[PDB]
């Protein structure tokens, strides 16, 4: 039975986490994203000036083309990419998927053109939302799932230190105490779960739903929750140059917690100080608006405080504080 560990590393300010993936013999640094189901890479089909600063996949060397298939995706921050599809061998932390669909980029929006921290994305949401036309394809995880010791993966994202993606096993040394599980609703293809209530510093409120999303840097919440949080942060203000609420870097921020099936998951106020806003001398908050989309996005700010188990049996998610 297979299992493996892939080590991830945060980029500056923990903006994204990248892990090496070997595709047909070339290793690329990909952003593992539990919020989407497409494995796409910078390729030799892009314009040569866009290939610059990246490790690229050359499909003609090892790939088997799926003639006539395309993919096209749009993410939450407006970025997008599209291209064609090949099958190849994809290895992550020593686990190999043979004949994995590899989505070679033909076009990428400006956001990706300017991000040289990754060479593409490895989706880990449910395969039901993979964008490949005319027949959708399975994610790396769905491809190898039946070969792993247990059909699950687990993640520890850390603040300015390397972390891990555990495939097919749970590493009990990565969290304190025991895991608490909650059911997942995969009807929209996401790892969606319910929280029963939340506490933002001195204020507590009713529960809501959200997705466990490794691909989003911040903790995005309903505007009512964000207002409630920052009303407790002296001098907090929104700054469109920074991307949301900012405050003095020395501020004492309140903790934020959510109650999930009996377990309190706490994000300490020191993790809510994302870093320099890059707008003078303020810091950007780790909690920001979800822009009225109707569900919360439990991104990296939240994951940096937990060890999370993504279990295809249920499916369900398990949580425990990171050791
Ligand atoms: C279609 O599904 C997606 O787009 C999913 C789920 C989703 C749906 C709707 C709203 C938000 C989130 O996002 P995702 O795949 O994680 C997607 C992946 C990314 C690498 C383009 N993240 C996003 O689009 C989020 N973008 C981010 O978090 C960007 N981060 C920053 O701009 C750093 C700033 C915030 C300091 C990326 C550069 C990392 C936005 C939600 C804020
Ligand atoms: C993950 O689990 C497998 C299955 O037991 C081991 O063979 C592998 O070395 C790693 O511990
Ligand atoms: C990344 O690869 C495997 C090991 O678990 C990890 O410690 C290393 O940094």
PDB file of N, CA and C in Angstrom, residues 73-150:
ATOM      1  N   UNK A  73     -10.293  27.642 -16.726  1.00  0.00           N
ATOM      2  CA  UNK A  73     -10.728  27.867 -15.292  1.00  0.00           C
ATOM      3  C   UNK A  73     -10.597  29.316 -14.903  1.00  0.00           C
ATOM      4  N   UNK A  74     -11.501  29.753 -14.039  1.00  0.00           N
ATOM      5  CA  UNK A  74     -11.493  31.087 -13.423  1.00  0.00           C
ATOM      6  C   UNK A  74     -11.461  30.963 -11.881  1.00  0.00           C
ATOM      7  N   UNK A  75     -10.560  31.605 -11.211  1.00  0.00           N
ATOM      8  CA  UNK A  75     -10.536  31.513  -9.751  1.00  0.00           C
ATOM      9  C   UNK A  75     -11.217  32.689  -9.096  1.00  0.00           C
ATOM     10  N   UNK A  76     -11.315  32.624  -7.769  1.00  0.00           N
ATOM     11  CA  UNK A  76     -11.926  33.600  -6.887  1.00  0.00           C
ATOM     12  C   UNK A  76     -11.336  35.017  -6.952  1.00  0.00           C
ATOM     13  N   UNK A  77     -10.068  35.195  -7.241  1.00  0.00           N
ATOM     14  CA  UNK A  77      -9.500  36.553  -7.351  1.00  0.00           C
ATOM     15  C   UNK A  77      -9.525  37.094  -8.786  1.00  0.00           C
ATOM     16  N   UNK A  78     -10.248  36.450  -9.681  1.00  0.00           N
ATOM     17  CA  UNK A  78     -10.344  36.851 -11.106  1.00  0.00           C
ATOM     18  C   UNK A  78      -9.236  36.224 -11.940  1.00  0.00           C
ATOM     19  N   UNK A  79      -8.263  35.520 -11.525  1.00  0.00           N
ATOM     20  CA  UNK A  79      -7.217  34.980 -12.363  1.00  0.00           C
ATOM     21  C   UNK A  79      -7.813  33.780 -13.178  1.00  0.00           C
ATOM     22  N   UNK A  80      -7.196  33.463 -14.303  1.00  0.00           N
ATOM     23  CA  UNK A  80      -7.706  32.401 -15.168  1.00  0.00           C
ATOM     24  C   UNK A  80      -6.570  31.811 -16.025  1.00  0.00           C
ATOM     25  N   UNK A  81      -6.869  30.632 -16.577  1.00  0.00           N
ATOM     26  CA  UNK A  81      -5.865  29.897 -17.408  1.00  0.00           C
ATOM     27  C   UNK A  81      -6.709  28.874 -18.200  1.00  0.00           C
ATOM     28  N   UNK A  82      -6.072  28.462 -19.312  1.00  0.00           N
ATOM     29  CA  UNK A  82      -6.796  27.473 -20.198  1.00  0.00           C
ATOM     30  C   UNK A  82      -5.726  26.790 -21.054  1.00  0.00           C
ATOM     31  N   UNK A  83      -6.106  25.692 -21.718  1.00  0.00           N
ATOM     32  CA  UNK A  83      -5.066  25.060 -22.585  1.00  0.00           C
ATOM     33  C   UNK A  83      -5.620  23.736 -22.975  1.00  0.00           C
ATOM     34  N   UNK A  84      -4.702  22.817 -23.227  1.00  0.00           N
ATOM     35  CA  UNK A  84      -5.014  21.475 -23.722  1.00  0.00           C
ATOM     36  C   UNK A  84      -4.589  20.409 -22.744  1.00  0.00           C
ATOM     37  N   UNK A  85      -4.772  19.156 -23.057  1.00  0.00           N
ATOM     38  CA  UNK A  85      -4.522  18.104 -22.072  1.00  0.00           C
ATOM     39  C   UNK A  85      -3.758  16.948 -22.481  1.00  0.00           C
ATOM     40  N   UNK A  86      -2.878  16.467 -21.615  1.00  0.00           N
ATOM     41  CA  UNK A  86      -2.055  15.297 -21.909  1.00  0.00           C
ATOM     42  C   UNK A  86      -2.153  14.327 -20.699  1.00  0.00           C
ATOM     43  N   UNK A  87      -1.766  13.088 -20.895  1.00  0.00           N
ATOM     44  CA  UNK A  87      -1.661  12.174 -19.700  1.00  0.00           C
ATOM     45  C   UNK A  87      -0.159  11.928 -19.543  1.00  0.00           C
ATOM     46  N   UNK A  88       0.275  11.840 -18.297  1.00  0.00           N
ATOM     47  CA  UNK A  88       1.682  11.565 -18.012  1.00  0.00           C
ATOM     48  C   UNK A  88       1.826  10.957 -16.627  1.00  0.00           C
ATOM     49  N   UNK A  89       3.073  10.703 -16.263  1.00  0.00           N
ATOM     50  CA  UNK A  89       3.328  10.132 -14.883  1.00  0.00           C
ATOM     51  C   UNK A  89       3.570  11.337 -13.949  1.00  0.00           C
ATOM     52  N   UNK A  90       2.826  11.252 -12.822  1.00  0.00           N
ATOM     53  CA  UNK A  90       2.966  12.442 -11.916  1.00  0.00           C
ATOM     54  C   UNK A  90       3.324  11.852 -10.543  1.00  0.00           C
ATOM     55  N   UNK A  91       4.466  12.328 -10.024  1.00  0.00           N
ATOM     56  CA  UNK A  91       4.938  11.820  -8.707  1.00  0.00           C
ATOM     57  C   UNK A  91       4.973  12.888  -7.623  1.00  0.00           C
ATOM     58  N   UNK A  92       4.309  12.550  -6.500  1.00  0.00           N
ATOM     59  CA  UNK A  92       4.268  13.511  -5.369  1.00  0.00           C
ATOM     60  C   UNK A  92       4.712  12.774  -4.102  1.00  0.00           C
ATOM     61  N   UNK A  93       5.722  13.242  -3.445  1.00  0.00           N
ATOM     62  CA  UNK A  93       6.221  12.596  -2.209  1.00  0.00           C
ATOM     63  C   UNK A  93       6.420  11.101  -2.353  1.00  0.00           C
ATOM     64  N   UNK A  94       6.908  10.730  -3.485  1.00  0.00           N
ATOM     65  CA  UNK A  94       7.188   9.382  -3.843  1.00  0.00           C
ATOM     66  C   UNK A  94       5.918   8.623  -4.235  1.00  0.00           C
ATOM     67  N   UNK A  95       4.764   9.115  -4.341  1.00  0.00           N
ATOM     68  CA  UNK A  95       3.572   8.374  -4.774  1.00  0.00           C
ATOM     69  C   UNK A  95       3.417   8.804  -6.278  1.00  0.00           C
ATOM     70  N   UNK A  96       3.277   7.768  -7.090  1.00  0.00           N
ATOM     71  CA  UNK A  96       3.125   8.005  -8.544  1.00  0.00           C
ATOM     72  C   UNK A  96       1.751   7.641  -9.104  1.00  0.00           C
ATOM     73  N   UNK A  97       1.199   8.544  -9.848  1.00  0.00           N
ATOM     74  CA  UNK A  97      -0.095   8.336 -10.540  1.00  0.00           C
ATOM     75  C   UNK A  97       0.360   8.092 -11.972  1.00  0.00           C
ATOM     76  N   UNK A  98       0.077   6.949 -12.616  1.00  0.00           N
ATOM     77  CA  UNK A  98       0.408   6.770 -14.027  1.00  0.00           C
ATOM     78  C   UNK A  98      -0.849   7.155 -14.840  1.00  0.00           C
ATOM     79  N   UNK A  99      -0.669   7.791 -15.957  1.00  0.00           N
ATOM     80  CA  UNK A  99      -1.782   8.287 -16.767  1.00  0.00           C
ATOM     81  C   UNK A  99      -2.638   9.389 -16.170  1.00  0.00           C
ATOM     82  N   UNK A 100      -2.035  10.167 -15.288  1.00  0.00           N
ATOM     83  CA  UNK A 100      -2.723  11.359 -14.709  1.00  0.00           C
ATOM     84  C   UNK A 100      -2.919  12.454 -15.771  1.00  0.00           C
ATOM     85  N   UNK A 101      -4.136  13.007 -15.816  1.00  0.00           N
ATOM     86  CA  UNK A 101      -4.390  14.136 -16.751  1.00  0.00           C
ATOM     87  C   UNK A 101      -3.564  15.363 -16.334  1.00  0.00           C
ATOM     88  N   UNK A 102      -2.734  15.908 -17.163  1.00  0.00           N
ATOM     89  CA  UNK A 102      -1.873  17.085 -16.933  1.00  0.00           C
ATOM     90  C   UNK A 102      -2.394  18.147 -17.920  1.00  0.00           C
ATOM     91  N   UNK A 103      -2.906  19.230 -17.343  1.00  0.00           N
ATOM     92  CA  UNK A 103      -3.517  20.330 -18.104  1.00  0.00           C
ATOM     93  C   UNK A 103      -2.431  21.335 -18.468  1.00  0.00           C
ATOM     94  N   UNK A 104      -1.996  21.296 -19.734  1.00  0.00           N
ATOM     95  CA  UNK A 104      -0.889  22.176 -20.167  1.00  0.00           C
ATOM     96  C   UNK A 104      -1.443  23.536 -20.501  1.00  0.00           C
ATOM     97  N   UNK A 105      -0.898  24.611 -19.884  1.00  0.00           N
ATOM     98  CA  UNK A 105      -1.352  25.961 -20.171  1.00  0.00           C
ATOM     99  C   UNK A 105      -0.870  26.445 -21.576  1.00  0.00           C
ATOM    100  N   UNK A 106      -1.951  26.964 -22.219  1.00  0.00           N
ATOM    101  CA  UNK A 106      -1.753  27.695 -23.471  1.00  0.00           C
ATOM    102  C   UNK A 106      -1.941  29.215 -23.202  1.00  0.00           C
ATOM    103  N   UNK A 107      -2.753  29.649 -22.297  1.00  0.00           N
ATOM    104  CA  UNK A 107      -3.007  31.025 -21.967  1.00  0.00           C
ATOM    105  C   UNK A 107      -3.084  31.152 -20.413  1.00  0.00           C
ATOM    106  N   UNK A 108      -2.561  32.225 -19.872  1.00  0.00           N
ATOM    107  CA  UNK A 108      -2.598  32.514 -18.435  1.00  0.00           C
ATOM    108  C   UNK A 108      -2.881  34.026 -18.242  1.00  0.00           C
ATOM    109  N   UNK A 109      -3.675  34.413 -17.212  1.00  0.00           N
ATOM    110  CA  UNK A 109      -3.989  35.843 -17.063  1.00  0.00           C
ATOM    111  C   UNK A 109      -2.782  36.499 -16.431  1.00  0.00           C
ATOM    112  N   UNK A 110      -2.816  37.806 -16.319  1.00  0.00           N
ATOM    113  CA  UNK A 110      -1.688  38.599 -15.776  1.00  0.00           C
ATOM    114  C   UNK A 110      -1.209  38.179 -14.397  1.00  0.00           C
ATOM    115  N   UNK A 111      -2.163  37.849 -13.535  1.00  0.00           N
ATOM    116  CA  UNK A 111      -1.780  37.388 -12.170  1.00  0.00           C
ATOM    117  C   UNK A 111      -0.788  36.290 -12.196  1.00  0.00           C
ATOM    118  N   UNK A 112      -1.048  35.242 -13.048  1.00  0.00           N
ATOM    119  CA  UNK A 112      -0.077  34.116 -13.110  1.00  0.00           C
ATOM    120  C   UNK A 112       1.217  34.505 -13.843  1.00  0.00           C
ATOM    121  N   UNK A 113       1.063  35.343 -14.817  1.00  0.00           N
ATOM    122  CA  UNK A 113       2.215  35.844 -15.604  1.00  0.00           C
ATOM    123  C   UNK A 113       3.172  36.549 -14.607  1.00  0.00           C
ATOM    124  N   UNK A 114       2.622  37.229 -13.618  1.00  0.00           N
ATOM    125  CA  UNK A 114       3.537  37.930 -12.694  1.00  0.00           C
ATOM    126  C   UNK A 114       3.942  37.094 -11.539  1.00  0.00           C
ATOM    127  N   UNK A 115       3.342  35.973 -11.257  1.00  0.00           N
ATOM    128  CA  UNK A 115       3.736  35.151 -10.104  1.00  0.00           C
ATOM    129  C   UNK A 115       4.797  34.147 -10.471  1.00  0.00           C
ATOM    130  N   UNK A 116       6.033  34.341 -10.146  1.00  0.00           N
ATOM    131  CA  UNK A 116       7.063  33.337 -10.494  1.00  0.00           C
ATOM    132  C   UNK A 116       7.315  32.378  -9.334  1.00  0.00           C
ATOM    133  N   UNK A 117       6.470  32.449  -8.324  1.00  0.00           N
ATOM    134  CA  UNK A 117       6.630  31.544  -7.141  1.00  0.00           C
ATOM    135  C   UNK A 117       6.127  30.090  -7.482  1.00  0.00           C
ATOM    136  N   UNK A 118       5.262  29.954  -8.467  1.00  0.00           N
ATOM    137  CA  UNK A 118       4.830  28.580  -8.772  1.00  0.00           C
ATOM    138  C   UNK A 118       4.911  28.393 -10.308  1.00  0.00           C
ATOM    139  N   UNK A 119       4.804  27.123 -10.617  1.00  0.00           N
ATOM    140  CA  UNK A 119       4.733  26.672 -12.060  1.00  0.00           C
ATOM    141  C   UNK A 119       3.358  26.061 -12.340  1.00  0.00           C
ATOM    142  N   UNK A 120       2.345  26.373 -11.565  1.00  0.00           N
ATOM    143  CA  UNK A 120       0.996  25.857 -11.788  1.00  0.00           C
ATOM    144  C   UNK A 120       0.384  25.372 -10.432  1.00  0.00           C
ATOM    145  N   UNK A 121      -0.796  24.763 -10.562  1.00  0.00           N
ATOM    146  CA  UNK A 121      -1.600  24.308  -9.449  1.00  0.00           C
ATOM    147  C   UNK A 121      -1.861  22.807  -9.472  1.00  0.00           C
ATOM    148  N   UNK A 122      -1.927  22.195  -8.287  1.00  0.00           N
ATOM    149  CA  UNK A 122      -2.337  20.749  -8.234  1.00  0.00           C
ATOM    150  C   UNK A 122      -3.638  20.755  -7.468  1.00  0.00           C
ATOM    151  N   UNK A 123      -4.768  20.480  -8.125  1.00  0.00           N
ATOM    152  CA  UNK A 123      -6.018  20.547  -7.450  1.00  0.00           C
ATOM    153  C   UNK A 123      -6.289  19.345  -6.541  1.00  0.00           C
ATOM    154  N   UNK A 124      -6.912  19.604  -5.391  1.00  0.00           N
ATOM    155  CA  UNK A 124      -7.273  18.518  -4.503  1.00  0.00           C
ATOM    156  C   UNK A 124      -8.734  18.593  -4.024  1.00  0.00           C
ATOM    157  N   UNK A 125      -9.528  19.350  -4.667  1.00  0.00           N
ATOM    158  CA  UNK A 125     -10.998  19.370  -4.425  1.00  0.00           C
ATOM    159  C   UNK A 125     -11.544  18.074  -5.081  1.00  0.00           C
ATOM    160  N   UNK A 126     -12.842  17.882  -5.043  1.00  0.00           N
ATOM    161  CA  UNK A 126     -13.404  16.622  -5.674  1.00  0.00           C
ATOM    162  C   UNK A 126     -13.342  16.731  -7.226  1.00  0.00           C
ATOM    163  N   UNK A 127     -13.143  15.575  -7.762  1.00  0.00           N
ATOM    164  CA  UNK A 127     -13.025  15.507  -9.252  1.00  0.00           C
ATOM    165  C   UNK A 127     -14.272  16.006  -9.958  1.00  0.00           C
ATOM    166  N   UNK A 128     -15.440  16.036  -9.405  1.00  0.00           N
ATOM    167  CA  UNK A 128     -16.696  16.423  -9.997  1.00  0.00           C
ATOM    168  C   UNK A 128     -16.627  17.857 -10.500  1.00  0.00           C
ATOM    169  N   UNK A 129     -15.734  18.667 -10.056  1.00  0.00           N
ATOM    170  CA  UNK A 129     -15.563  20.026 -10.571  1.00  0.00           C
ATOM    171  C   UNK A 129     -14.327  20.226 -11.477  1.00  0.00           C
ATOM    172  N   UNK A 130     -13.664  19.186 -11.909  1.00  0.00           N
ATOM    173  CA  UNK A 130     -12.528  19.296 -12.850  1.00  0.00           C
ATOM    174  C   UNK A 130     -13.146  19.950 -14.147  1.00  0.00           C
ATOM    175  N   UNK A 131     -12.407  20.838 -14.752  1.00  0.00           N
ATOM    176  CA  UNK A 131     -12.927  21.644 -15.908  1.00  0.00           C
ATOM    177  C   UNK A 131     -12.678  21.017 -17.299  1.00  0.00           C
ATOM    178  N   UNK A 132     -11.994  19.917 -17.402  1.00  0.00           N
ATOM    179  CA  UNK A 132     -11.666  19.311 -18.735  1.00  0.00           C
ATOM    180  C   UNK A 132     -12.918  18.952 -19.545  1.00  0.00           C
ATOM    181  N   UNK A 133     -12.878  19.387 -20.775  1.00  0.00           N
ATOM    182  CA  UNK A 133     -13.972  19.173 -21.789  1.00  0.00           C
ATOM    183  C   UNK A 133     -13.355  18.348 -22.956  1.00  0.00           C
ATOM    184  N   UNK A 134     -14.073  17.410 -23.540  1.00  0.00           N
ATOM    185  CA  UNK A 134     -15.462  17.046 -23.226  1.00  0.00           C
ATOM    186  C   UNK A 134     -15.811  16.027 -22.134  1.00  0.00           C
ATOM    187  N   UNK A 135     -14.848  15.371 -21.570  1.00  0.00           N
ATOM    188  CA  UNK A 135     -15.037  14.430 -20.416  1.00  0.00           C
ATOM    189  C   UNK A 135     -14.075  14.942 -19.310  1.00  0.00           C
ATOM    190  N   UNK A 136     -14.678  15.145 -18.141  1.00  0.00           N
ATOM    191  CA  UNK A 136     -13.733  15.640 -17.030  1.00  0.00           C
ATOM    192  C   UNK A 136     -12.839  14.578 -16.601  1.00  0.00           C
ATOM    193  N   UNK A 137     -11.691  14.883 -15.972  1.00  0.00           N
ATOM    194  CA  UNK A 137     -10.659  13.966 -15.531  1.00  0.00           C
ATOM    195  C   UNK A 137     -10.519  13.935 -13.958  1.00  0.00           C
ATOM    196  N   UNK A 138      -9.831  12.928 -13.460  1.00  0.00           N
ATOM    197  CA  UNK A 138      -9.666  12.859 -11.997  1.00  0.00           C
ATOM    198  C   UNK A 138      -8.401  13.587 -11.525  1.00  0.00           C
ATOM    199  N   UNK A 139      -8.546  14.087 -10.275  1.00  0.00           N
ATOM    200  CA  UNK A 139      -7.410  14.765  -9.621  1.00  0.00           C
ATOM    201  C   UNK A 139      -6.372  13.735  -9.272  1.00  0.00           C
ATOM    202  N   UNK A 140      -5.150  14.197  -9.029  1.00  0.00           N
ATOM    203  CA  UNK A 140      -4.084  13.335  -8.614  1.00  0.00           C
ATOM    204  C   UNK A 140      -4.597  12.428  -7.468  1.00  0.00           C
ATOM    205  N   UNK A 141      -5.204  13.017  -6.465  1.00  0.00           N
ATOM    206  CA  UNK A 141      -5.664  12.228  -5.304  1.00  0.00           C
ATOM    207  C   UNK A 141      -6.696  11.138  -5.748  1.00  0.00           C
ATOM    208  N   UNK A 142      -7.694  11.512  -6.550  1.00  0.00           N
ATOM    209  CA  UNK A 142      -8.650  10.511  -6.978  1.00  0.00           C
ATOM    210  C   UNK A 142      -7.954   9.445  -7.806  1.00  0.00           C
ATOM    211  N   UNK A 143      -6.977   9.799  -8.583  1.00  0.00           N
ATOM    212  CA  UNK A 143      -6.225   8.827  -9.353  1.00  0.00           C
ATOM    213  C   UNK A 143      -5.535   7.790  -8.472  1.00  0.00           C
ATOM    214  N   UNK A 144      -4.855   8.175  -7.396  1.00  0.00           N
ATOM    215  CA  UNK A 144      -4.044   7.273  -6.604  1.00  0.00           C
ATOM    216  C   UNK A 144      -4.800   6.759  -5.396  1.00  0.00           C
ATOM    217  N   UNK A 145      -5.931   7.282  -5.103  1.00  0.00           N
ATOM    218  CA  UNK A 145      -6.661   6.981  -3.836  1.00  0.00           C
ATOM    219  C   UNK A 145      -6.775   5.493  -3.448  1.00  0.00           C
ATOM    220  N   UNK A 146      -7.139   4.708  -4.407  1.00  0.00           N
ATOM    221  CA  UNK A 146      -7.329   3.237  -4.222  1.00  0.00           C
ATOM    222  C   UNK A 146      -6.022   2.544  -4.008  1.00  0.00           C
ATOM    223  N   UNK A 147      -4.844   3.079  -4.269  1.00  0.00           N
ATOM    224  CA  UNK A 147      -3.574   2.487  -4.029  1.00  0.00           C
ATOM    225  C   UNK A 147      -2.972   2.872  -2.640  1.00  0.00           C
ATOM    226  N   UNK A 148      -3.511   3.940  -2.066  1.00  0.00           N
ATOM    227  CA  UNK A 148      -2.926   4.369  -0.763  1.00  0.00           C
ATOM    228  C   UNK A 148      -3.401   3.460   0.398  1.00  0.00           C
ATOM    229  N   UNK A 149      -2.612   3.446   1.436  1.00  0.00           N
ATOM    230  CA  UNK A 149      -2.948   2.665   2.648  1.00  0.00           C
ATOM    231  C   UNK A 149      -4.312   3.118   3.125  1.00  0.00           C
ATOM    232  N   UNK A 150      -4.658   4.394   3.183  1.00  0.00           N
ATOM    233  CA  UNK A 150      -5.950   4.929   3.594  1.00  0.00           C
ATOM    234  C   UNK A 150      -6.321   5.989   2.541  1.00  0.00           C
TER     235      UNK A 150
END
